[PDB]
Structures are given as structure tokens and as C-alpha cells.
Design a protein around this motif. Structure first.
Motif, PDB file in Angstrom:
ATOM      1  N   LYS A   8       0.789  -1.220   0.000  1.00  0.00           N
ATOM      2  CA  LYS A   8       0.000   0.000   0.000  1.00  0.00           C
ATOM      3  C   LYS A   8       0.828   1.281   0.000  1.00  0.00           C
ATOM      4  CE  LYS A   8      -1.613   1.481   3.763  1.00  0.00           C
ATOM      5  NZ  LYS A   8      -2.299   1.609   5.083  1.00  0.00           N
ATOM      6  N   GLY A   9       0.463   2.204  -0.879  1.00  0.00           N
ATOM      7  CA  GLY A   9       1.176   3.463  -0.955  1.00  0.00           C
ATOM      8  C   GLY A   9       0.932   4.259  -2.221  1.00  0.00           C
ATOM      9  N   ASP A  10       1.950   5.021  -2.602  1.00  0.00           N
ATOM     10  CA  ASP A  10       1.944   5.865  -3.790  1.00  0.00           C
ATOM     11  C   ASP A  10       1.787   5.012  -5.058  1.00  0.00           C
ATOM     12  OD1 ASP A  10       3.187   7.163  -6.141  1.00  0.00           O
ATOM     13  OD2 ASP A  10       3.625   8.786  -4.739  1.00  0.00           O
ATOM     14  N   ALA A  11       0.806   5.343  -5.891  1.00  0.00           N
ATOM     15  CA  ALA A  11       0.567   4.595  -7.126  1.00  0.00           C
ATOM     16  C   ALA A  11       1.820   4.539  -8.008  1.00  0.00           C
ATOM     17  CB  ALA A  11      -0.584   5.225  -7.894  1.00  0.00           C
ATOM     18  N   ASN A  12       2.550   5.649  -8.066  1.00  0.00           N
ATOM     19  CA  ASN A  12       3.768   5.712  -8.865  1.00  0.00           C
ATOM     20  C   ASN A  12       4.829   4.782  -8.312  1.00  0.00           C
ATOM     21  OD1 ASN A  12       2.977   7.845 -10.764  1.00  0.00           O
ATOM     22  ND2 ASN A  12       2.990   9.171  -8.946  1.00  0.00           N
ATOM     23  N   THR A  13       4.920   4.726  -6.988  1.00  0.00           N
ATOM     24  CA  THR A  13       5.881   3.857  -6.332  1.00  0.00           C
ATOM     25  C   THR A  13       5.511   2.400  -6.624  1.00  0.00           C
ATOM     26  OG1 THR A  13       6.247   5.468  -4.563  1.00  0.00           O
ATOM     27  CG2 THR A  13       6.870   3.164  -4.123  1.00  0.00           C
ATOM     28  N   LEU A  14       4.220   2.094  -6.541  1.00  0.00           N
ATOM     29  CA  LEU A  14       3.747   0.737  -6.809  1.00  0.00           C
ATOM     30  C   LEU A  14       4.021   0.336  -8.257  1.00  0.00           C
ATOM     31  CD1 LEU A  14       0.354   0.816  -4.868  1.00  0.00           C
ATOM     32  CD2 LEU A  14       2.511  -0.277  -4.208  1.00  0.00           C
ATOM     33  N   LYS A  15       3.894   1.289  -9.177  1.00  0.00           N
ATOM     34  CA  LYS A  15       4.147   1.023 -10.592  1.00  0.00           C
ATOM     35  C   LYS A  15       5.619   0.673 -10.794  1.00  0.00           C
ATOM     36  CE  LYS A  15       3.245   2.830 -15.226  1.00  0.00           C
ATOM     37  NZ  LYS A  15       2.687   3.962 -16.018  1.00  0.00           N
ATOM     38  N   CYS A  16       6.494   1.388 -10.095  1.00  0.00           N
ATOM     39  CA  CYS A  16       7.926   1.128 -10.184  1.00  0.00           C
ATOM     40  C   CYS A  16       8.220  -0.271  -9.619  1.00  0.00           C
ATOM     41  CB  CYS A  16       8.706   2.187  -9.389  1.00  0.00           C
ATOM     42  SG  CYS A  16      10.509   1.992  -9.453  1.00  0.00           S
ATOM     43  N   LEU A  17       7.579  -0.609  -8.507  1.00  0.00           N
ATOM     44  CA  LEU A  17       7.792  -1.922  -7.900  1.00  0.00           C
ATOM     45  C   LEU A  17       7.363  -3.056  -8.830  1.00  0.00           C
ATOM     46  CD1 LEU A  17       6.759  -1.335  -4.196  1.00  0.00           C
ATOM     47  CD2 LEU A  17       9.061  -1.682  -5.158  1.00  0.00           C
ATOM     48  N   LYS A  22       9.269  -7.703 -12.084  1.00  0.00           N
ATOM     49  CA  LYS A  22       9.393  -8.510 -13.297  1.00  0.00           C
ATOM     50  C   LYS A  22      10.768  -9.171 -13.371  1.00  0.00           C
ATOM     51  CE  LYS A  22       5.376  -6.877 -14.491  1.00  0.00           C
ATOM     52  NZ  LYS A  22       4.132  -7.699 -14.424  1.00  0.00           N
ATOM     53  N   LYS A  23      11.710  -8.676 -12.573  1.00  0.00           N
ATOM     54  CA  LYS A  23      13.065  -9.222 -12.549  1.00  0.00           C
ATOM     55  C   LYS A  23      13.119 -10.481 -11.683  1.00  0.00           C
ATOM     56  CE  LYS A  23      13.492  -5.509 -14.757  1.00  0.00           C
ATOM     57  NZ  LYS A  23      14.364  -4.386 -14.314  1.00  0.00           N
ATOM     58  N   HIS A  24      12.042 -10.720 -10.943  1.00  0.00           N
ATOM     59  CA  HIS A  24      11.931 -11.888 -10.075  1.00  0.00           C
ATOM     60  C   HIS A  24      10.551 -12.504 -10.288  1.00  0.00           C
ATOM     61  CE1 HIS A  24      14.960  -9.274  -8.365  1.00  0.00           C
ATOM     62  NE2 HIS A  24      15.379 -10.230  -7.555  1.00  0.00           N
ATOM     63  N   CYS A  25      10.161 -12.625 -11.553  1.00  0.00           N
ATOM     64  CA  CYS A  25       8.859 -13.173 -11.922  1.00  0.00           C
ATOM     65  C   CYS A  25       8.563 -14.576 -11.384  1.00  0.00           C
ATOM     66  CB  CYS A  25       8.713 -13.163 -13.445  1.00  0.00           C
ATOM     67  SG  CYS A  25      10.123 -13.886 -14.314  1.00  0.00           S
ATOM     68  N   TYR A  28       6.753 -15.098  -7.444  1.00  0.00           N
ATOM     69  CA  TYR A  28       5.353 -14.866  -7.125  1.00  0.00           C
ATOM     70  C   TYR A  28       4.468 -15.475  -8.201  1.00  0.00           C
ATOM     71  CZ  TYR A  28       5.754 -11.045 -10.548  1.00  0.00           C
ATOM     72  OH  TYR A  28       5.985 -10.313 -11.690  1.00  0.00           O
ATOM     73  N   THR A  29       3.224 -15.763  -7.836  1.00  0.00           N
ATOM     74  CA  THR A  29       2.281 -16.353  -8.768  1.00  0.00           C
ATOM     75  C   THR A  29       1.670 -15.264  -9.644  1.00  0.00           C
ATOM     76  OG1 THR A  29       1.736 -18.145  -7.223  1.00  0.00           O
ATOM     77  CG2 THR A  29       0.176 -17.723  -9.007  1.00  0.00           C
ATOM     78  N   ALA A  30       1.138 -14.222  -9.015  1.00  0.00           N
ATOM     79  CA  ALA A  30       0.529 -13.127  -9.758  1.00  0.00           C
ATOM     80  C   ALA A  30       0.603 -11.804  -9.003  1.00  0.00           C
ATOM     81  CB  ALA A  30      -0.928 -13.467 -10.072  1.00  0.00           C
ATOM     82  N   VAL A  31       0.552 -10.704  -9.750  1.00  0.00           N
ATOM     83  CA  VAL A  31       0.573  -9.371  -9.166  1.00  0.00           C
ATOM     84  C   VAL A  31      -0.572  -8.614  -9.834  1.00  0.00           C
ATOM     85  CG1 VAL A  31       2.177  -8.465 -10.910  1.00  0.00           C
ATOM     86  CG2 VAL A  31       1.904  -7.285  -8.707  1.00  0.00           C
ATOM     87  N   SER A  32      -1.355  -7.897  -9.041  1.00  0.00           N
ATOM     88  CA  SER A  32      -2.508  -7.172  -9.571  1.00  0.00           C
ATOM     89  C   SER A  32      -2.222  -5.794 -10.123  1.00  0.00           C
ATOM     90  CB  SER A  32      -3.565  -6.998  -8.480  1.00  0.00           C
ATOM     91  OG  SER A  32      -3.175  -5.966  -7.582  1.00  0.00           O
ATOM     92  N   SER A  33      -3.244  -5.251 -10.780  1.00  0.00           N
ATOM     93  CA  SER A  33      -3.202  -3.905 -11.299  1.00  0.00           C
ATOM     94  C   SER A  33      -3.397  -3.088 -10.022  1.00  0.00           C
ATOM     95  CB  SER A  33      -4.361  -3.679 -12.272  1.00  0.00           C
ATOM     96  OG  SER A  33      -5.581  -4.156 -11.730  1.00  0.00           O
ATOM     97  N   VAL A  60      13.299  -8.712  -2.905  1.00  0.00           N
ATOM     98  CA  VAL A  60      12.903  -7.415  -3.429  1.00  0.00           C
ATOM     99  C   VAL A  60      13.124  -6.341  -2.372  1.00  0.00           C
ATOM    100  CG1 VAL A  60      11.213  -8.458  -4.964  1.00  0.00           C
ATOM    101  CG2 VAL A  60      10.506  -7.667  -2.701  1.00  0.00           C
ATOM    102  N   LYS A  61      13.517  -5.160  -2.823  1.00  0.00           N
ATOM    103  CA  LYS A  61      13.742  -4.041  -1.919  1.00  0.00           C
ATOM    104  C   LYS A  61      12.498  -3.163  -1.991  1.00  0.00           C
ATOM    105  CE  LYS A  61      17.343  -2.987  -4.349  1.00  0.00           C
ATOM    106  NZ  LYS A  61      17.368  -4.229  -5.169  1.00  0.00           N
ATOM    107  N   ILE A  62      11.719  -3.155  -0.914  1.00  0.00           N
ATOM    108  CA  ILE A  62      10.493  -2.363  -0.857  1.00  0.00           C
ATOM    109  C   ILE A  62      10.723  -1.135   0.017  1.00  0.00           C
ATOM    110  CG2 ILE A  62       8.055  -2.355  -0.198  1.00  0.00           C
ATOM    111  CD1 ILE A  62       7.934  -5.285  -0.785  1.00  0.00           C
TER     112      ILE A  62
END
Lengths: 74, 74
Positions: A8-17, A22-25, A28-33, A60-62
Motif C-alpha cells: 500500500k502506498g503511492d501509485a507511482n511507487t507501486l508502478k515502479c515496484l 518482473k526481474k523476479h517473476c 510470485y504467482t501473480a501481481v494485480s493492477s 525485493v527491496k520495498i
């Protein structure tokens, strides 16, 4: 049944994450919009097991500005 | 910690449900915008307790074409 995570947080930050994830696809099974309650933005991730979830989080570095919450679905 | 529900299916059907849910706004804490894995669409609902979650499910009429899954967050 299925371990999940909410970021949860900044939409832009989430988009970057999501881009970085994708570098560690295989970690995880799935990631949402990006969604929201309808305010902050949220992304949901699903995993194959608690181990995979932790492998993902250990790699991952969050940003501290992003709240990480864990849970489970059926 | 917090009981959650995922309603999965047709985005249009989910939109109608969110509209109908407004008639029982006290039966849930929050309802999300429609998201997807990135396919079917999904809406997340959060509740104050397992009792409220069941009160909600006992009162709202959810189409058989919509998959209802329950879980919990922290």
C-alpha cells in the motif's frame, strides 16, 4: 490456502515496484493492477507457498514508504 | 486480523454488485475498485469481524457466476 501480500502506498511507487518485480517473476504467482478503496493505492500479490512469499520479500527491496501486509486466501 | 472477501467475475457484474452493496453500506468496512491480475475481474471487500462478513453474505444476493472467496489480512 494461498498466501497473499498487499503493498500500500503511492501509485507511482507501486508502478515502479511492479516493474522491478518482473526481474523476479518466478518469486510470485501473480501481481494485480493498482486498485484503491472506493486515498492510497494498493497492489495485491499471490504466492505458491509461505516459503515463496518470504523468498520474494527477502529479495525485493520495498521502500519504507510502502506498507507491506500479509494474509491468506482460500 | 481483518476478514476479507474477493468477488471474482464479470467486471459489469461486479459493478452492479458494488451498486447494490451501497444498500448495505454498514455490512462492510470497505469495497475496492475493480482490479485484475496483470482474465476475470476482482473486487476486494474488508470487514470489521467474521460476524459482519457473514451478515453481509447472508444479506446480499451474489450471482452463481461470481466466485466468492474468503480470507484474512493483518
Amino acid at each position: 490456502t494461498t498466501p497473499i501480500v498487499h503493498l500500500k502506498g503511492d501509485a507511482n511507487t507501486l508502478k515502479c515496484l511492479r516493474y522491478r518485480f518482473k526481474k523476479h517473476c518466478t518469486l510470485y504467482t501473480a501481481v494485480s493492477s493498482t486498485w484503491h478503496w472506493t486515498k492510497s493505492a494498493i497492489v495485491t500479490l499471490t504466492y505458491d507457498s509461505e516459503w515463496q512469499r518470504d523468498q520474494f520479500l527477502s529479495q525485493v527491496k520495498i521502500p519504507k514508504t510502502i506498507t507491506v501486509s500479509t494474509g491468506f486466501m482460500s
